[PDB]
UniProtKB/Swiss-Prot annotation:
It comes from Gallus gallus. It comes from the Eukaryota. One of its GO terms (cellular component) is troponin complex. This is Troponin I, fast skeletal muscle. Binds to actin and tropomyosin.
Length: 52
């Protein structure tokens, strides 16, 4: 099923951060990770009140 092999090959984790993420069809776990990480983690890192 090369067709798919190619599809998945490309069609995958696609995000540019900054409130712009694209979860492929796989999502499931891939997403769960990013899905969660992204956003929340973005705010944390964006915050981290405290230098060095």
């Amino acid at each position: 099923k090369v067709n798919m092999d190619l599809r998945a090959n490309l069609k995958q984790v696609k995000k540019e951060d900054t409130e712009k993420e694209k979860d492929l069809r796989d999502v499931g776990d891939w997403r769960k990770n990013i899905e969660e990480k992204s956003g929340m983690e973005g705010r944390k890192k964006m915050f981290e009140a405290g230098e060095s």
